[PDB]
């Protein structure tokens, strides 16, 4: 038989209408529910909300909420990527103005689950 899905504990998010949905879990394969992502996080579709589906392999998507890193303004650096959105795992090069550089001889910043690593700032 197919294993029913228990209440989904969505990392950096959760289900809408939690109080009404929670007493009816575990749920059968094929069931789906609208879910949200917390601040600074988004769905694989690029929105703050979508639907999580109970499949034979469990909840789909497996990673419902991914970190979104917005490239900040560089006081003493080149601002072509200012305001540009980057999803978790994606990297971008930091171009600083002459006489300025990253925290420790670095040139690339990566959007991790917690945010930018390292912090994009020219001196």
């Amino acid at each position: 038989t197919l294993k029913p899905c228990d209440y989904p504990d969505i990392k950096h998010g959760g289900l809408y209408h939690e109080n009404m949905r929670r007493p009816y879990f575990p749920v059968a394969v094929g069931k789906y529910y609208s879910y949200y992502c917390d601040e600074h996080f988004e769905t694989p579709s690029g929105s703050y909300w979508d639907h999580i589906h109970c499949t034979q392999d469990g909840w789909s998507p497996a990673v419902p909420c991914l970190r979104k890193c917005y490239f900040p303004y560089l006081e003493n650096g080149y601002n072509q990527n200012h305001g540009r959105k980057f999803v978790q795992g994606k990297s971008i090069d930091v171009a600083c103005h002459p006489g300025y550089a990253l925290p420790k001889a670095q040139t690339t910043v990566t959007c991790m689950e917690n945010g930018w690593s390292p912090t994009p700032r020219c001196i």
């Binding site: 809408y16 109080n19 009404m20 789906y32 529910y33 601040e39 639907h51 305001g83 959105k85």
Partner: protein
Amino acid sequence: AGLADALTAPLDHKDKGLQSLTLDQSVAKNEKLKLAAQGAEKTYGNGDSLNTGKLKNDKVSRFDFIRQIEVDGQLITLESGEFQVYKQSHSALTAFQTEQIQDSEHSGKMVAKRQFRIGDIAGEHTSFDKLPEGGRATYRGTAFGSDDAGGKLTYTIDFAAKQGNGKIEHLKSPELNVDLAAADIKPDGKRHAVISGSVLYNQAEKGSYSLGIFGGKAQEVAGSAEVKTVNGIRHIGLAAKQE
């Protein structure tokens, strides 16, 4: 209509119920919701109350919405469109018809995107432990989706069996005129009477529905439904009352 009064006038005890509606799921703690109608304007406020008493019962009240966030002492628009309020005597629900949102790829850009989502579903929750011991009750009301408030909702609850079932009719989109399958009444975390079951179209499962029982004598039902159609998932606002 009472749209301007709902935004400007303070809370009055003599007003027709539901008098007040706490905006919790409609406005997040970090954000602000700016509502405008009939020349009036008001900003909320997670936990702030909407003066529903000034609005008309058994109808959809429409407002222009702006979802704002304070960045450098100024309010910046994240999402805009139409804010819908369906008022009943012991229950009320909010809906968001998104027209514009902040570009998913850029923080400083706004794009035209249409989305329909149910915000709050609140009122005087019926306790699961205070429900009638027996008898059958028929609830008649409205089913409302994107650009359509003409849907008809019929729901029946058997208090002896602690079960409920219903039907949606007259919505412009035929696929949304679904059957609300037989489902058990269960207590929630706060021991409020709730109902959740399957949504069926032509005897095939298309999604789920959830309802909350409202009023001291279980007079009303309010909630939502999420239905799969040929062109994607569509949400429906649900609200019905006893005759």
